[PDB]
Symmetry: C4
Subunit: 484 residues, 4 copies
């Protein structure tokens, strides 16, 4: 039906498109744009473009594996079950050429799909059409039709012409990069994990193509007595035995290992070996690079924590701090950050208000709801108050509050025991969920009892500067607390 047929060629309302265009109305604006052409635009983000590129990737990985092998290890590439594969697949890759004249293009420099037919055709014919046409049209069977209008020379030249189909790797690279830019925008794949699998796919393909080339150059020379295929006496081995050996040569030049049974004798086998070493050791260097980037991404937060701590050790050693105090600072960072690197002030500034308020109310509303100041207060005021709490960790023996010091802030216990070392009583061990220093906010005096950490206290603290900064926003609660 024509409505569903047109619907496939437009950018759909889906998790990607509503994130790329930012609203379902901006998606509809782009659909209403695509409706300008006489079906002569399919959008780069359309379901048609997706499923077409998906069947093109499985078509093209299959074809870029099968074509090197059928051109290299098989006689009679003019046979019915082989020309049926090549005419069918070159039809699919010619439909794909026609589709790219009507396919838009994602202009990264303007963040817009070009999406107009004369602009798409003129940019495409200037960008990639020559490699796409050469790799699309059956130039090998065209040359057989011209030559039928010498047999060993025709079978030589048609094998080189048939490897112009390998320029489908330009489309494989392109359609993979387009669909991976789209899939990062859909699934947040780790960059180095996408990149290592691009390169593992490229290594396997270039290793496979070198594996074919290592036999093809012997074959195009009619297996001279000084090439490895003749020296290994395997010019008449099965296509699979030959391919396995030829691949093993290429793979040994790739993965940095060796040769076949001998160093190359003939100058063409020697130069194809050097090319395959250059391509191979380039791939393996590129793969050690991607493996390194993968590894450095996978522990990146732990690596950044230990880099940050090493700057604490550099601070400690610059100031020549005693080993007893350096151990105290180490044990502080171990309890304050738990080996995790973040900036709370940075991250909370990157969030919206509702999401700060949800994070803050999950962390701190359980601590504050026990306090008689806040158990009876308005939910909007308490939500504004909890955002002013500063998290503090006190190691055992640290005085959180000292008797006779000015009451600049008051505290709440998330975890640990804090002993109220009062001037005329036994030490009341305030356990997790307790609160203290509360007379600082109401009375503006010096503290009436010291409070010291009896374990590694994890505290939330409320400065009287920040308390008053929030009470200026809620004068109804200010007049209420002023009653007591």
């Amino acid at each position: 039906m024509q409505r569903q047929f047109t619907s496939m060629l437009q950018p759909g309302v889906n998790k990607f498109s509503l994130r790329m265009f930012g609203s379902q109305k901006a998606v509809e604006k782009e659909q209403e744009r695509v409706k300008t052409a006489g079906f002569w635009i399919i959008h780069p983000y359309s379901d048609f473009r997706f499923y077409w590129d998906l069947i093109m990737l499985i078509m093209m990985v299959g074809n870029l594996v099968i074509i090197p092998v059928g051109i290299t290890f098989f006689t009679e590439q003019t046979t019915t079950p082989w020309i049926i594969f090549n005419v069918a697949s070159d039809t699919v890759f010619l439909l794909d050429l026609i589709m790219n004249f009507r396919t838009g293009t994602v202009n990264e420099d303007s963040s817009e799909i070009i999406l107009d037919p004369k602009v798409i055709k003129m940019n495409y014919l200037k960008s990639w059409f020559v490699v796409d046409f050469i790799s699309s049209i059956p130039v090998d069977y065209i040359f057989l039709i011209v030559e039928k209008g010498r047999a060993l020379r025709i079978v030589r030249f048609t094998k080189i012409l048939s490897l112009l189909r390998l320029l489908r790797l330009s489309r494989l690279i392109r359609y993979i990069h387009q669909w991976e830019e789209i899939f990062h925008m859909t699934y947040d794949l780790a960059s180095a994990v996408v990149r290592i699998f691009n390169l593992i796919g490229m290594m396997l393909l270039l290793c496979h193509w070198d594996g074919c080339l290592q036999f093809l150059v012997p074959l195009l020379q009619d297996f001279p007595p000084d090439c490895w295929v003749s020296l290994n006496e395997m010019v008449n081995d099965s296509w699979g035995k030959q391919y396995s050996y030829a691949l093993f040569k290429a793979m040994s030049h790739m993965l940095c290992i060796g040769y076949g049974a001998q160093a190359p004798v003939s100058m063409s086998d020697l130069w194809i070996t050097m090319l395959s070493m250059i391509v191979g050791a380039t791939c393996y260097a590129m793969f050690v690079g991607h493996a390194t980037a993968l590894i450095q991404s996978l522990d990146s937060s732990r690596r950044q924590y230990q880099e940050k701590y090493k700057q604490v050790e550099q601070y400690m050693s610059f100031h020549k701090l005693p080993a007893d105090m350096r151990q105290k600072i180490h044990d502080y960072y171990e309890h304050r950050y738990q080996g995790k690197i973040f900036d709370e002030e940075n991250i909370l500034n990157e969030l919206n208000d509702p999401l700060r308020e949800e994070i803050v109310n999950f962390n701190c509303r359980k601590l504050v709801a026990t306090m008689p100041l806040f158990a009876n207060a308005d939910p909007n005021f308490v939500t504004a108050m909890l955002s002013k709490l500063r998290f503090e960790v006190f190691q055992p023996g640290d005085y959180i509050i000292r008797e006779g010091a000015v009451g600049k802030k008051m505290y709440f216990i998330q975890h640990g025991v804090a002993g109220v070392i009062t001037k005329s009583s036994k030490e009341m061990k305030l356990t997790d969920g307790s609160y203290f220093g509360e007379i600082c906010l109401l009375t503006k005096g010096r503290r009436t009892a010291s409070v010291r950490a009896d374990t590694y206290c994890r505290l939330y603290s409320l400065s009287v500067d920040n308390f008053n900064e929030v009470l200026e926003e809620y004068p109804m609660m200010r007049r209420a607390f002023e009653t007591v």
Copy 2:
């Protein structure tokens, strides 16, 4: 005794657990949670889980080394001293299967142990039970009992079935990663040093397994005349000579070196060689990646210092500063930072108050205690004052204070000689521990003598803005200094 027996299965009060749950009361809350099941939960952080996984790791590293070798290089894996090892160890790995149906699970996405028996069993049977059961139960001896209900075919198939025990590597990977996540939370091991030793352990194991596989595939084919074992004439060498050669092949494919005495002749030896090259050169790329991450972590602070300084050189060169002044800025950074990278303002903001106050009193109380302003003052006031000191380094010939300039700050000497170049006297060389500019805080006038660095002075400075900011916090001392 039942109390001690139950006590092992709960999360203990230890350096890890009191840091993971954050308080001894939150540990007790988790112990009181674990008491819900009828012994049918042991906690993922329990001493039982630890010592069970510890004896499982030494059991499993031993077993994953011994099983490949006994299946590959030995005849008669049905013999008494071999079935005793396999029935005993498969009992231990079946107790371990049963233990995982009652073992909780650390849910990283919620930072909670799942710790309920129907939730643990349903998540486990959906996650890992198939690989754990196949690797637990003696499928090789089960197949011998079924087959006893052809001998060369049975001895072929039972060796492949017996390598289903190698799926204990899933448990080895898991129990190592669990105990290393726990040990980072206990000992702060360097991330890349833990990771390099995971991979060195994995390389040795995969090299050992490839070493076995390289002989096993020849053996399962009954040593055909075109495999390396037959070509090396070593089908009847000792198990140790065979293992050493087979390992050397695998290790040469791993560490990027070569083959045995020849490139592979038979297609199965050729493909097991290609598999071992792919696995091997993958491992070595992963190991160059981890070696690089280890190296970049080990000098990370020096690397970050020289990156920061290179931005000072980029600033100097952007501004086209004279080489004489660039050398002056270099010698300044050399004395100001001593090649150490830190941010004092960032690090002091990450600490608690008691730990800032201890660091500050260690650095600066020796400098300030000589001053007549502070030798007679209250310890709380001086501790508040010392935090306002800013560290400054003056190179020789730098005027710290100029005669007739406004007295915006006053100084204390940590190190170096600063000459008071007075307008009517000889230059009094103020040595380390001296102080100057002190009339700025009391008198609010322009300076009565210039002071210039005669060496690389390291100074602490007290702005009169920050002095007054601290005196507003201690009006009793403000009225006292106002007396003189």
Copy 3:
């Protein structure tokens, strides 16, 4: 003509020079400086220096490829068509020696061209003249003229003397680094892409030189029976067959692959092999390093985004946030940043005012021009206002404004639907380009209706603190809005 001839030797008015000196008048000041010498200065940035170094690079890459080969694989380097190349090229490299005595020098430590003839000559004769003179003057043909004033010993020693021409690689390294420092300042090439192509060029050259050396040391020994050239029976193969094999040896020692057909027999072939392995595996390690740096530069922004997000996951897990809220924070970062890392506050502070104002007016003037407050206002006021807008993203179900809350800021919709959930009406779905909370700026009251995100809203927000901060700058508009 003398004016055009002098004009080539001065720093031109071009995209590089007007950026290096910063103005066409500072370029003219440097041209007027260069006019001090009697043509005895050509400037390091001059068109003469450029085109001279350009023809010197193509001369020198050609010569450093051709000289090793003609000295190694050819007899009779005293022949007419070979001495014509060497006398012509050594003339060009002697003109280049003379040009460097009159060429200035870019002093990186002062960001100034030294550009005075006695200072240039005295610095050059102290820096590089010995390597440049030895590589310039035909020391090989000088020695033949002295020796004509024994033939196998003369043909030995003249080949070693002729490889003193390979010290032109010092000039190749220098002129490449000078022109790449200039080209970074002209085209912003990716650092690692310039560096990888330096090293690929250096690898190809050192592989080529090792390839020559591997044959040259056999040749200088008159091909002893224990060197690879004699063992391969190829002392009489064509120069191209020999070069291809000798290169293949060197390339296999470089790219970590193997040897020739045998491990080296004679001690000189063995030590040249060890030298070529040390040089080769040094190059390949340097190339894996540059490949890694290239890869880590190419995905650097995605890598930095996933590092930043992993710190959000570390924050979430430190605070033990529920998996439901962690997913909410993930979906927030996905819509707030779209996988892109930047700091808007940092980047806008790095720009000038006109460029902030152009970026801000492109982003926000389409959103504000619908509002009745701003459709009728002055372009300078609106441009000042739009800079105070803060971008906020609200996930579906997030209340942007709550009824009865204080109106601290008002909003504009870039994208998404926000429902006005009014206390006495149906939910008016405000679509993209709408605005709400507008009574907050005029009336200073609590909000009269709640507004909640019905999709992922992308909003611009205007705090009443920042609105009043901008209206203090435009009192004419302040008195106008005070009318309504």
Copy 4:
């Protein structure tokens, strides 16, 4: 003389020591500390310790190269010219053992030299004395004296005992790391360049030791017919031919290349080959890691600039900015930063006042000295003023000032032409060194003429907020400018 003899053992007054202790008085305090012991302390930073470790490093690199070779490739290590080297060198390494009982120790955890004799002896005997004593005392000649109190077994065992001298590598590692920690604190060597040369030195040594070991294990077995030395028929080749081959084996296992002429036949040669591959490929992985760290340090500032710019491209693409404006922002960053990364605000905050003032007066005093406001003002006031200048770059066509806009800041031209596009006159092209907007500071009105960039202006700007902030510091100049 006893004063000079004692003087060598104390920490001298030198560029390192005056930077490590921070003052010549703190150096004297450490010298006065060292005077506590009865010559039984030499300080870890002393000239004696330096020159002793310097002659120990050249002694020890020589010895750790010569001992493997003399034990491996030479008969009769009991001969006069060999026992003279070993008794002399083992005397030097026994004096060094005695020196370490009186040598202090740099405690990195407290940044103090331990420098007391019972504390030094007790820490040393617990830390390194066992490896130092075993490697110091002639255990090989002790065993010959005991055995003289069987000849092939004695010559076997004495070679293994003599390689206990190779535990001098513990001292080589230690004394290199101590002197490189001291030399970073003296010369600011690039971290990765020091580290790559540690590892190149370690690779050469381990390659040399493997090269010896590869022959030594054959020799200790009396050259069995299945080891490479016997298969290569070279048990009677010269020591140099054997060493060159044995080294080549080890070096090929190190640099990832191959074997000797064959894969190993005997199980001991096979296992020494596997050990040498494990050690070798570990070294090469460690060396690719250090090469990568060296490369990533060498372009680190350019890499950081292109990372920062890529965040500007991520900002531009997140905001979907037009390609015309993205090019404008690119050309802005190219002129604003010139491809150089720094933070001016960060770097100027890290400096002292005199060095900020020197940098600022070099940059800006030439620009301000033309202005009639500042040509007649006091040097202290102008130096305070120039620090308030903010550098701004305006691209051509950018309006710096607009007619009728409020005069919030005034400008000075460092470079470029800015046209005063006056409302009633021809465009006065203000060239480099001019100033404009000057009526903003005196008159507080809207601008009387627009000023637009006619080239890429580089400007210094003075906000009237910052002008008034500086004039509050100099009321004498405030009352003077108030006269006009």
